[PDB]
Amino acid sequence: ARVFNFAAGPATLPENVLLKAQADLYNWRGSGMSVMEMSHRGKEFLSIIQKAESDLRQLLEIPQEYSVLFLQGGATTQFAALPLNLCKSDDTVDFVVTGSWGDKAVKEAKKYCKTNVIWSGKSEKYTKVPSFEELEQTPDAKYLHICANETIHGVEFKDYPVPKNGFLVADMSSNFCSKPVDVSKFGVIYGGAQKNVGPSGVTIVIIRKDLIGNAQDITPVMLDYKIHDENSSLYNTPPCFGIYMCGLVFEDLLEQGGLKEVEKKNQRKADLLYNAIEESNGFFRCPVEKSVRSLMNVPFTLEKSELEAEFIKEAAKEKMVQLKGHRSVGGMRASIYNAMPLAGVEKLVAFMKDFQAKHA
Amino acid sequence: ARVFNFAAGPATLPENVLLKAQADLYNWRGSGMSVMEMSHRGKEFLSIIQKAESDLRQLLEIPQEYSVLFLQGGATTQFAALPLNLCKSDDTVDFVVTGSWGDKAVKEAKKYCKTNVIWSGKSEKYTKVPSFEELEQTPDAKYLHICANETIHGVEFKDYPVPKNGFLVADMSSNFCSKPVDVSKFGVIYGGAQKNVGPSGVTIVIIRKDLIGNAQDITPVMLDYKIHDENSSLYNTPPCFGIYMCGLVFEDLLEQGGLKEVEKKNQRKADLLYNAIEESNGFFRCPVEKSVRSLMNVPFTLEKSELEAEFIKEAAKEKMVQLKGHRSVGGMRASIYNAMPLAGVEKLVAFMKDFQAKHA
Ligand SMILES: *[C@H](N[C@@H](COP(=O)(O)O)C(=O)O)c1c(COP(=O)(O)O)cnc(C)c1O
Ligand SMILES: *[C@H](N[C@@H](COP(=O)(O)O)C(=O)O)c1c(COP(=O)(O)O)cnc(C)c1O
Ligand code: NA
């Protein structure tokens, strides 16, 4: 039997998607070959990548004046690609840092331009999002960078800051296609697929067309947005199978009723877990400020922290796996992405109630 | 029915490997999840990447003092990573250019250091390999770059030049694991997996351990060999499912008897096609000099070139697809990688003989 897989990325996937991929793995739609053997210059793969793009455009209501790029290298490669493409070496980028993934973006961007961290959550252990009107943005900043869902720290933007001088860029890796997003407010949205929308090996970049072009001279060709855009993500050999898998996920999210329906389910199942924590009378604790609690990644600790290893081991015996926190922070982390069944969060909640009764 | 798929990359894969992947896709070995859902930091995936590495080490007889890295970005990303990691910006790299893939590696390296093309086959249409003793290598060249199998032009190194000042770097994308290689002759071997050893999304880099480190300060962290080496290719989220597929391919190459036997089969089926061309009294032509004719990619043309579209259409109607040449050169190109069944080459040869008879 399949387990309830609380991993933060790569992560659990819908069973109907996995079964479709199994059904077609040897011979996709009578083409006589697997997706994994198709030429990226051929008509079958063309149909796949084009439908993945159109389905994603439908899901997020992406306006026509945005490009959609399917790339390799992870969100971490975009930490370099963003300043290399969007800035000159003496331009400045503003960052709002609400957890360690935004901090990693700052440190990589320092190689390629000037960076200003205009706000950091670190003094309160990355539990909060700033009041935006209070933000002091840099008068000449090319763009303002956020990590919309801080996967380790469980801090999620529920509304967005307005850039003063330039455009907004958001790492949406761990809440990608979890809810509607006004894409027009952003110059760039990017995310690795593996958290919430596919297998690892694909990164999606949604980028306003008038921002493509004029990358720095030292930009590798494989990081150049203009190269990717003008070749429709087929400049070199793309991650064909991962793009196909993302397409299955997008098609299925549309069948579920789209991102408004996805968000409803995420909110419901996240409420069950957060309520159980809040009702445990301190036995379980979530440090994050209520209004920015992530629907995707739920970090929590035990008041008796020495009990956390037993919690994690017994949960895994109960077929609930990968609940240990990220190694940087420890504690526990329940990642409850789109495809996590409601019954899995219910099982974790019932396990938590039973564990507390036995250790209190 | 499945077709004979002569694509140059991505390419045909073994049917037993595809079917193994299919049977484990929903729940790998009763572990309760797909490979596609496994955490890269969990023991199941660690077991997979570790065996893929040791199996590849067995196949190529890789010495202990070399690292094996499983990366994203394609071989094209390595065109930037090689000089970024291995050179200072005022160092010089020598290139022997035997086709257009070597030319693409020169153009990218020029962003990051100096380049000398010490020999180029362009003047004779990329049909030959130089005499090595006569090469004029640059006295202080950090390394000498070759493309061991020029995929579009059908030119293949059968033995290797000896670098004068530095070490040898070879792009082996399209003949990777087609035959034994004395790895100790090289400082770096690299290759996209999708030509001969898996689906696209994985690039393999075999690099002598004393060459790792001291990349240029502008090197993106995701292109840095020391980062990847010290994290055992798990610095960020790896292309887990492509690595797993590579592992299945490697396991099956071992079961076939290793690269000595793989090479024997490649030589046998290449000979059938090359002999058919030479016996065709000019009806089909291969321009490449006989001693360097690739076993992996066989470009050929029709004396009556106006027949090429009918040849390709009739071949496809006979379940032989993707025989058109690379778009940069035209003609025909039969890619006949490890997994291309002998029967597919035989069908091609018989179809060619019939085609000539009908268009005498
Ligand atoms: C991915 N975060 C995951 C994985 O973290 P590690 O175990 O340290 O690799 C998490 O568990 O938090 C992530 C990334 C990085 O994307 P890749 O380069 O691996 O594709 C970037 N931004 C966000 C918000 C992430 O969650
Ligand atoms: C891959 N060459 C293939 C693919 O060529 P395109 O259709 O132009 O993409 C071919 O048909 O010749 C190749 C590469 C590039 O690898 P990726 O960056 O796409 O992974 C580099 N070197 C060699 C020898 C190649 O064959
Ligand atoms: Na099975």
Numbering used by the authors:
A (entry chain B), B (entry chain A): 71 to 430
Wording from the paper:
PSATs are PLP-dependent enzymes that catalyze the second step of the phosphorylated pathway – reversible conversion of 3-PHP to PSer in a Glu-linked reaction. In this work, we describe a structure of the isoform 1 of chloroplastic PSAT from A. thaliana (At), which is further referred to in the manuscript as AtPSAT1. AtPSAT1 is a dimeric PLP-dependent AT that, similarly to other α-type ATs, binds the prosthetic group in the cavity within the large domain. The three crystal structures of AtPSAT1 present snapshots along the catalytic event showing PLP internal aldimine state, complex with PMP after the first half-reaction and PSer-PLP geminal diamine intermediate state.
Finally, crystallization of AtPSAT1 with 50 mM PSer and without sulfate ions in the crystallization conditions succeeded and the structure has shown somewhat unexpected results. The electron density maps revealed not only the position of PSer in the active site itself, but they also indicated the presence of two covalent bonds: between the nitrogen atom of PSer and C4′ of PLP, and between C4′ of PLP and Nζ atom of K265. The reaction snapshot in the AtPSAT1-PSer structure actually shows one of the reaction intermediates – the PLP-PSer geminal diamine. As a result of creation of two covalent bonds, the C4′ atom of PLP presents sp3 hybridization. In the PLP-PSer geminal diamine state, K265 and its neighborhood present almost identical conformation as in the internal aldimine state (the AtPSAT1-PLP structure). The bound PSer creates several hydrogen bonds in the active site, which include: a salt bridge between PSer carboxylate and guanidine group of R403 placed in the β14 strand, an H-bond between one of the oxygen atoms from the carboxyl group of PSer and N𝜀 of the indole ring of W171 from the α5 helix. Oxygen atoms from the phosphate group of PSer create several hydrogen bonds, either directly with protein side chains or through water molecules. These include direct hydrogen bonds with H396, R397 (loop between β13 and β14), and with R111∗, H110∗ (loop between η2 and α3). The superposition of AtPSAT1-PLP and AtPSAT1-PSer shows a pronounced movement of the loop 391–401 toward the catalytic site associated with PSer binding. Moreover, the structure of AtPSAT1-PSer shows the closed conformation of the gate-keeping loop between β13 and β14 (residues 391–401), required for the stabilization of AtPSAT1-PSer geminal diamine and most likely for the catalysis as well.
